[PDB]
Amino acid sequence: MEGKWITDQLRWKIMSCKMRIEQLKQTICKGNEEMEKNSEGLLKTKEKN
Amino acid sequence: VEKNRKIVAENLEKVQAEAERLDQEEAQYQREYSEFKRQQLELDDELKSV
Numbered sequence: 562m563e564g565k566w567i568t569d570q571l572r573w574k575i576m577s578c579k580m581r582i583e584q585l586k587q588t589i590c591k592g593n594e595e596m597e598k599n600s601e602g603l604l605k606t607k608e609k610n
Numbered sequence: 611v612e613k614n615r616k617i618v619a620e621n622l623e624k625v626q627a628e629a630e631r632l633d634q635e636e637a638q639y640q641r642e643y644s645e646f647k648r649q650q651l652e653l654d655d656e657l658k659s660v
Binding site: 589592596607 | 611612614615618619621622625626628629632
């Protein structure tokens, strides 16, 4: 067990990190889409102004 | 991206802040112009009556 226990900790670390990359990539997509929308809204508002 | 988002959010907010101010001004122009129109619509009837 003291052997597998160490490699499974690493496996969980990799899987956790991958789950966080999946999260961060989505967070960046969300952040970008919010920024892109806000940029298009700002442009329209300046035009309106 | 958070920094850019925050900066753009402030830009949108501050630009829209001017939009709502101009809305109050345009609303005031209407409120005042409506009064000048009321007077004008009487002077035209006084002119025609006289």
